[PDB]
Amino acid sequence: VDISTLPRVKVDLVKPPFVHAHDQVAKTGPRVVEFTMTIEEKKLVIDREGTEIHAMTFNGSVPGPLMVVHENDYVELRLINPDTNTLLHNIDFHAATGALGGGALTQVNPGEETTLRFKATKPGVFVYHCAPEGMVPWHVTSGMNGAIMVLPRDGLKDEKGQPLTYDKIYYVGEQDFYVPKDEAGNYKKYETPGEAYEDAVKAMRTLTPTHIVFNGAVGALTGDHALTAAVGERVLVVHSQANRDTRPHLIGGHGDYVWATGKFRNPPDLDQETWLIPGGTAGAAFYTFRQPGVYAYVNHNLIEAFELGAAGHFKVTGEWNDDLMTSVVKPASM
Amino acid sequence: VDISTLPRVKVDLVKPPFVHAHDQVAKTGPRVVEFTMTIEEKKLVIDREGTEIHAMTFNGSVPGPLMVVHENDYVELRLINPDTNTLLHNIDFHAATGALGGGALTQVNPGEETTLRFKATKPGVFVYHCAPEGMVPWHVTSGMNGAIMVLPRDGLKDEKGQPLTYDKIYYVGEQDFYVPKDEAGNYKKYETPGEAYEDAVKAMRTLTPTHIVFNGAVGALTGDHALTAAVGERVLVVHSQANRDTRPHLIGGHGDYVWATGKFRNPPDLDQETWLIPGGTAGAAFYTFRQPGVYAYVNHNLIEAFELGAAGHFKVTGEWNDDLMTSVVKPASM
Amino acid sequence: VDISTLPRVKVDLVKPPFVHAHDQVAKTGPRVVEFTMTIEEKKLVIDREGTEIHAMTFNGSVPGPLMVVHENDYVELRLINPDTNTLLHNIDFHAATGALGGGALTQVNPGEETTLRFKATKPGVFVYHCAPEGMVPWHVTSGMNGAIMVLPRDGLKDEKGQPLTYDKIYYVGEQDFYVPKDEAGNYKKYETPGEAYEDAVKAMRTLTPTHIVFNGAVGALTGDHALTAAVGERVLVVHSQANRDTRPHLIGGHGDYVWATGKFRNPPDLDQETWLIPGGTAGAAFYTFRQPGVYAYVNHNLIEAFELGAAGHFKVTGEWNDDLMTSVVKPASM
Ligand SMILES: [Cu+2]
Ligand SMILES: [Cu+2]
Ligand SMILES: [Cu+2]
Ligand SMILES: [Cu+2]
Ligand SMILES: [Cu+2]
Ligand SMILES: [Cu+2]
């Protein structure tokens, strides 16, 4: 095919956990979908104590934005590494085929840009991440990862082949950080990236994260930034973890339909309490809310959730169903 | 519906790994199934060395008892926190919808009780656990978790829709403990719960269990308390892990039909050697024994099994099948 | 059945990652398939630094060779423990039924041999490993494990029941080692096995591998020993991990059809980016290559891959498809 004969559509990305505009069922034939991301190395405060790290980001956020296309669209990404950064970066799409997912073709030094195109031949949610030869886990675990959703052209389907249509979508990126510690257990204070590298490596080799967070920081998806829904709304939560296994769980709900390893030509698993998303994968869970109130959404290693950061909230509006749950006798002495 | 028009049936629970009486296929219409549990904080010796912890239990056991209902029954639990305890507790059912699984409605101080009702709208095995705001993983990893089985009204089915009927059921609760250690590696000796809390938190944040046990202690499901079966019996083993992934395996057998993430509207996986039950989940495996003798049942991280405690035994009675396995030449010099 | 009436066929094993000759679709009726393995305790250098361990091997390799039979063949293994070894060993097949997978029938001291037969009643890839009572994880994590593939008699099938036929097969055994460390972090230097045992136990109880390798060493499946394929070839990669979870990923490709937990009566999962193989399991992934060049094949905990050793390479020959992926604008300043 002469790709130049296809429609081009430019996407304007949004910051997670929100997701840019798309149509579930494709309203056109295959397109070249044009994306731009600018790499930003920046300081980020990741916990309540004020711990500040040097993060490596796509588009300024941890995770990077969710990109959305349909099966057999072409993804055309312009990747910009401004001269205000100091490191070499690239990008690997798990949705793509060839050249280390794109990484072998997208190495950009500070002051460089590149444009990669690939055909999105398989439907699903997929991780993308930076992967510079010889320093791959350092970039990934500094926050340099996101996800892309490749929808089937006729949208999502249940285990029987009937449509599933979400009303809302959110993207939860989960990040394991390995902040170097001294022997007493305090995070080291690096009076450059090179000077940090060996103890970053040492810290990673412990295999023990210091922080495991959603949307880049402890508490990021809480308070004025809680996720929201109404009773009766159908919500898709895309969840990625580029480096380490996670086990999502909606406290007070379920995953009604879950693609735990994220690939839509497979039937979803029904009625999940908790699912395993392996490190290096994106998964997706669909739920119809049935009760109002606060929900937590967690990695159900509850130490990881409530001590290390892997917990967010939904605030859900609407009527309470006492058939479905009620306090028959409220807590009392007697 | 006027729930007061429905039959009530009172269940009398039993200590794991045994399971209270139920009928696989529902012999009545939907019911309100009434359960009572009394919280008990108590000392438990968890290993061969005599290490004693302060456990937090439902009904005196780690795990708490297995509760069994059918889909679209109502579970009505009276939860009692006697004044001989010292902490606040509650309960979250992963089977339930709303109010953090029940936790937001069931906070009981010592000297209080409460009664919660919920509709068991999804079939499967599910975790339940205590979850007091701000101290969730401490209670869970002190043993305060169990499981509930919500059977389909027409019992279990294989991947083709034909019945699967078990002759015996067992409930294996797997518990990760985080006993605080001093710098030399010995378990700290807490001359109160408050004085323990910070190092309990420190110990949990290592993400490294000190003990991983079935039925509350190293060796609990061995000797006079080995699980039993006969050749030709169909056995369902429900296995839960409220906080951490496990990978069960029957040494010398298989999971003929396994719902690894526990939800019965999905077809089972066939012929498993080993399955992954994510932390925060219950799973169920069905097996028909074909050979007599001793079997081990383990978490197949074999360090976790044989060094940290996650191993039990079956003793199986009956005839040996030499077609299926035989020693052609017994060990010898020659 | 009088097993003596069946054909006997002797298999001559090969060193991983290669796999001995077999036919996907069975060309005969059920057979007694005869295998011989000789246990070898030997020193192995496992990393670039020259760290040398005392490995415990089947047939001289880590992993042990892949054995291949068909469903309802009999596997007859002669297991030899020469008097040049010093330890007791045995073998447990996860494919087998009874006697702890064979371990209870195959205990051989140095200078002994034994012959075990079992019926391979379930199709799939399965772990085998040594398991001497009281020292199981030490032998497994010293390298004493491999896998066996029990093919359906009519070969592999996709999720719709149509044939899947591989052109090439490779066996990747992934090994977690726990080399004991002193307080400063250097590997201890054991001026016997008995003298090593307690700190081997200590090291394992950390649950933190020092090395996680494919084919027995860092870099073993790279350079002159990279895996190979051509564009358009169908490749099956069998992957085992006898003790610890892994999450394989082909960097630049996919698992087109994946049996993550390895059992062929189940439909494969399609289009996987990354799969979870639980510790104690073998899995299998089928992929048709579409692009030439270098691929990495990794455990996608990228710390485990690129710092601890769990990475190999494919070198793929053929034509590059610019429709599927191209650099539209190569990296440049502008
Ligand atoms: Cu980067
Ligand atoms: Cu990757
Ligand atoms: Cu409690
Ligand atoms: Cu929970
Ligand atoms: Cu051995
Ligand atoms: Cu095993």
Side-chain angles (χ1 to χ4, degrees):
Chain A
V1 167
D2 180 347
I3 289 169
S4 70
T5 67
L6 295 180
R8 279 166 175 274
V9 62
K10 182 176 190 182
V11 167
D12 293 291
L13 292 164
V14 304
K15 183 182 157 115
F18 301 95
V19 176
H20 76 80
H22 58 281
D23 291 295
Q24 289 170 57
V25 172
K27 293 188 173 189
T28 71
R31 297 180 296 177
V32 180
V33 187
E34 301 164 317
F35 298 89
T36 291
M37 294 194 290
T38 299
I39 296 156
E40 189 188 5
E41 292 165 15
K42 63 199 298 171
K43 291 176 180 174
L44 289 180
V45 172
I46 61 169
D47 66 21
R48 290 306 187 194
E49 293 77 11
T51 304
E52 188 174 58
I53 63 160
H54 289 273
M56 301 182 202
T57 79
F58 292 108
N59 253 27
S61 58
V62 175
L66 190 70
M67 303 164 59
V68 183
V69 301
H70 288 84
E71 183 181 345
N72 295 317
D73 287 340
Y74 299 81
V75 174
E76 186 169 296
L77 175 67
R78 177 187 179 210
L79 181 65
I80 301 167
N81 189 2
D83 67 18
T84 48
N85 290 328
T86 66
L87 306 174
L88 166 68
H89 300 282
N90 64 356
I91 191 164
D92 175 344
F93 285 90
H94 288 187
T97 300
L100 307 170
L105 296 175
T106 55
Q107 298 156 28
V108 281
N109 293 277
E112 297 187 314
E113 66 174 75
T114 187
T115 300
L116 176 69
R117 181 169 61 231
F118 70 89
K119 197 179 194 170
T121 61
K122 293 176 181 296
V125 287
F126 296 83
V127 167
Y128 66 76
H129 61 84
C130 182
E133 183 175 353
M135 58 179 50
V136 173
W138 183 42
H139 285 240
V140 177
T141 68
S142 295
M144 207 162 171
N145 61 84
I148 177 165
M149 183 165 67
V150 180
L151 282 163
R153 287 179 53 71
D154 191 39
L156 301 179
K157 301 291 168 61
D158 71 15
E159 82 294 359
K160 298 180 192 195
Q162 284 295 122
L164 288 172
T165 303
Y166 48 91
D167 300 304
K168 305 194 76 178
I169 181 172
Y170 291 113
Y171 173 37
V172 177
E174 176 175 341
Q175 185 60 60
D176 48 320
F177 290 113
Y178 301 81
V179 182
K181 287 173 24 179
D182 64 31
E183 22 198 337
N186 289 126
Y187 302 129
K188 300 194 150 177
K189 302 217 40 126
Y190 299 81
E191 292 183 352
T192 72
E195 297 183 5
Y197 187 70
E198 291 301 322
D199 285 352
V201 170
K202 175 180 176 167
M204 286 186 292
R205 290 171 63 97
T206 72
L207 304 174
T208 305
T210 56
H211 301 76
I212 305 166
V213 297
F214 296 161
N215 218 46
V218 177
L221 301 180
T222 72
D224 295 335
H225 291 94
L227 307 182
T228 61
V231 170
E233 294 195 294
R234 298 164 294 180
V235 180
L236 191 77
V237 179
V238 177
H239 192 131
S240 72
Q241 225 300 9
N243 192 64
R244 184 178 181 273
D245 300 338
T246 182
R247 54 214 56 81
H249 180 101
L250 179 62
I251 304 185
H254 297 89
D256 287 334
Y257 304 90
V258 180
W259 297 265
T261 54
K263 308 298 169 285
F264 301 134
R265 290 187 184 132
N266 301 289
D269 293 333
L270 308 174
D271 297 332
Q272 304 294 275
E273 66 190 308
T274 304
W275 44 105
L276 195 295
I277 302 181
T281 321
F286 186 107
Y287 182 62
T288 301
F289 281 91
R290 296 199 72 195
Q291 294 281 214
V294 177
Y295 296 65
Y297 177 78
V298 299
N299 169 335
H300 210 294
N301 179 317
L302 298 170
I303 305 164
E304 299 180 5
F306 292 112
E307 283 293 330
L308 303 183
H313 298 157
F314 280 85
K315 298 174 184 182
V316 181
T317 296
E319 82 278 356
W320 179 267
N321 182 341
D322 284 304
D323 182 68
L324 185 59
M325 181 179 285
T326 200
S327 183
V328 181
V329 180
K330 294 171 199 160
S333 321
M334 76 200 70
Chain B
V1 167
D2 180 347
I3 289 169
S4 70
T5 67
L6 295 180
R8 279 166 175 274
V9 62
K10 182 176 190 182
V11 167
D12 293 291
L13 292 164
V14 304
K15 183 182 157 115
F18 301 95
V19 176
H20 76 80
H22 58 281
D23 291 295
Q24 289 170 57
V25 172
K27 293 188 173 189
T28 71
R31 297 180 296 177
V32 180
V33 187
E34 301 164 317
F35 298 89
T36 291
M37 294 194 290
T38 299
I39 296 156
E40 189 188 5
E41 292 165 15
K42 63 199 298 171
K43 291 176 180 174
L44 289 180
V45 172
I46 61 169
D47 66 21
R48 290 306 187 194
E49 293 77 11
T51 304
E52 188 174 58
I53 63 160
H54 289 273
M56 301 182 202
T57 79
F58 292 108
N59 253 27
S61 58
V62 175
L66 190 70
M67 303 164 59
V68 183
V69 301
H70 288 84
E71 183 181 345
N72 295 317
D73 287 340
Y74 299 81
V75 174
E76 186 169 296
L77 175 67
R78 177 187 179 210
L79 181 65
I80 301 167
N81 189 2
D83 67 18
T84 48
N85 290 328
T86 66
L87 306 174
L88 166 68
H89 300 282
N90 64 356
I91 191 164
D92 175 344
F93 285 90
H94 288 187
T97 300
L100 307 170
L105 296 175
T106 55
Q107 298 156 28
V108 281
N109 293 277
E112 297 187 314
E113 66 174 75
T114 187
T115 300
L116 176 69
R117 181 169 61 231
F118 70 89
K119 197 179 194 170
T121 61
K122 293 176 181 296
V125 287
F126 296 83
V127 167
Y128 66 76
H129 61 84
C130 182
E133 183 175 353
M135 58 179 50
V136 173
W138 183 42
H139 285 240
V140 177
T141 68
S142 295
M144 207 162 171
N145 61 84
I148 177 165
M149 183 165 67
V150 180
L151 282 163
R153 287 179 53 71
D154 191 39
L156 301 179
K157 301 291 168 61
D158 71 15
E159 82 294 359
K160 298 180 192 195
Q162 284 295 122
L164 288 172
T165 303
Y166 48 91
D167 300 304
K168 305 194 76 178
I169 181 172
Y170 291 113
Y171 173 37
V172 177
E174 176 175 341
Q175 185 60 60
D176 48 320
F177 290 113
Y178 301 81
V179 182
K181 287 173 24 179
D182 64 31
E183 22 198 337
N186 289 126
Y187 302 129
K188 300 194 150 177
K189 302 217 40 126
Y190 299 81
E191 292 183 352
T192 72
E195 297 183 5
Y197 187 70
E198 291 301 322
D199 285 352
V201 170
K202 175 180 176 167
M204 286 186 292
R205 290 171 63 97
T206 72
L207 304 174
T208 305
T210 56
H211 301 76
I212 305 166
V213 297
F214 296 161
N215 218 46
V218 177
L221 301 180
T222 72
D224 295 335
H225 291 94
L227 307 182
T228 61
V231 170
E233 294 195 294
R234 298 164 294 180
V235 180
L236 191 77
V237 179
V238 177
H239 192 131
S240 72
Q241 225 300 9
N243 192 64
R244 184 178 181 273
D245 300 338
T246 182
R247 54 214 56 81
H249 180 101
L250 179 62
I251 304 185
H254 297 89
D256 287 334
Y257 304 90
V258 180
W259 297 265
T261 54
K263 308 298 169 285
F264 301 134
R265 290 187 184 132
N266 301 289
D269 293 333
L270 308 174
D271 297 332
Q272 304 294 275
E273 66 190 308
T274 304
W275 44 105
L276 195 295
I277 302 181
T281 321
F286 186 107
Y287 182 62
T288 301
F289 281 91
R290 296 199 72 195
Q291 294 281 214
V294 177
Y295 296 65
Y297 177 78
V298 299
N299 169 335
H300 210 294
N301 179 317
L302 298 170
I303 305 164
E304 299 180 5
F306 292 112
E307 283 293 330
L308 303 183
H313 298 157
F314 280 85
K315 298 174 184 182
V316 181
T317 296
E319 82 278 356
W320 179 267
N321 182 341
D322 284 304
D323 182 68
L324 185 59
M325 181 179 285
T326 200
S327 183
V328 181
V329 180
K330 294 171 199 160
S333 321
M334 76 200 70
Chain C
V1 167
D2 180 347
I3 289 169
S4 70
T5 67
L6 295 180
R8 279 166 175 274
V9 62
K10 182 176 190 182
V11 167
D12 293 291
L13 292 164
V14 304
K15 183 182 157 115
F18 301 95
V19 176
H20 76 80
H22 58 281
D23 291 295
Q24 289 170 57
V25 172
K27 293 188 173 189
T28 71
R31 297 180 296 177
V32 180
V33 187
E34 301 164 317
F35 298 89
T36 291
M37 294 194 290
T38 299
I39 296 156
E40 189 188 5
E41 292 165 15
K42 63 199 298 171
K43 291 176 180 174
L44 289 180
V45 172
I46 61 169
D47 66 21
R48 290 306 187 194
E49 293 77 11
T51 304
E52 188 174 58
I53 63 160
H54 289 273
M56 301 182 202
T57 79
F58 292 108
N59 253 27
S61 58
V62 175
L66 190 70
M67 303 164 59
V68 183
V69 301
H70 288 84
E71 183 181 345
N72 295 317
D73 287 340
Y74 299 81
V75 174
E76 186 169 296
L77 175 67
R78 177 187 179 210
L79 181 65
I80 301 167
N81 189 2
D83 67 18
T84 48
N85 290 328
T86 66
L87 306 174
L88 166 68
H89 300 282
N90 64 356
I91 191 164
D92 175 344
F93 285 90
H94 288 187
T97 300
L100 307 170
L105 296 175
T106 55
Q107 298 156 28
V108 281
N109 293 277
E112 297 187 314
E113 66 174 75
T114 187
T115 300
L116 176 69
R117 181 169 61 231
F118 70 89
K119 197 179 194 170
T121 61
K122 293 176 181 296
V125 287
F126 296 83
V127 167
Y128 66 76
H129 61 84
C130 182
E133 183 175 353
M135 58 179 50
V136 173
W138 183 42
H139 285 240
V140 177
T141 68
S142 295
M144 207 162 171
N145 61 84
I148 177 165
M149 183 165 67
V150 180
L151 282 163
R153 287 179 53 71
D154 191 39
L156 301 179
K157 301 291 168 61
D158 71 15
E159 82 294 359
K160 298 180 192 195
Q162 284 295 122
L164 288 172
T165 303
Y166 48 91
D167 300 304
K168 305 194 76 178
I169 181 172
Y170 291 113
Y171 173 37
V172 177
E174 176 175 341
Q175 185 60 60
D176 48 320
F177 290 113
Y178 301 81
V179 182
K181 287 173 24 179
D182 64 31
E183 22 198 337
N186 289 126
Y187 302 129
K188 300 194 150 177
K189 302 217 40 126
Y190 299 81
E191 292 183 352
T192 72
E195 297 183 5
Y197 187 70
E198 291 301 322
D199 285 352
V201 170
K202 175 180 176 167
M204 286 186 292
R205 290 171 63 97
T206 72
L207 304 174
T208 305
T210 56
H211 301 76
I212 305 166
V213 297
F214 296 161
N215 218 46
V218 177
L221 301 180
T222 72
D224 295 335
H225 291 94
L227 307 182
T228 61
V231 170
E233 294 195 294
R234 298 164 294 180
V235 180
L236 191 77
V237 179
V238 177
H239 192 131
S240 72
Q241 225 300 9
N243 192 64
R244 184 178 181 273
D245 300 338
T246 182
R247 54 214 56 81
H249 180 101
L250 179 62
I251 304 185
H254 297 89
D256 287 334
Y257 304 90
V258 180
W259 297 265
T261 54
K263 308 298 169 285
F264 301 134
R265 290 187 184 132
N266 301 289
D269 293 333
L270 308 174
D271 297 332
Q272 304 294 275
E273 66 190 308
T274 304
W275 44 105
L276 195 295
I277 302 181
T281 321
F286 186 107
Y287 182 62
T288 301
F289 281 91
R290 296 199 72 195
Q291 294 281 214
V294 177
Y295 296 65
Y297 177 78
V298 299
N299 169 335
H300 210 294
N301 179 317
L302 298 170
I303 305 164
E304 299 180 5
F306 292 112
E307 283 293 330
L308 303 183
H313 298 157
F314 280 85
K315 298 174 184 182
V316 181
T317 296
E319 82 278 356
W320 179 267
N321 182 341
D322 284 304
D323 182 68
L324 185 59
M325 181 179 285
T326 200
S327 183
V328 181
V329 180
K330 294 171 199 160
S333 321
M334 76 200 70

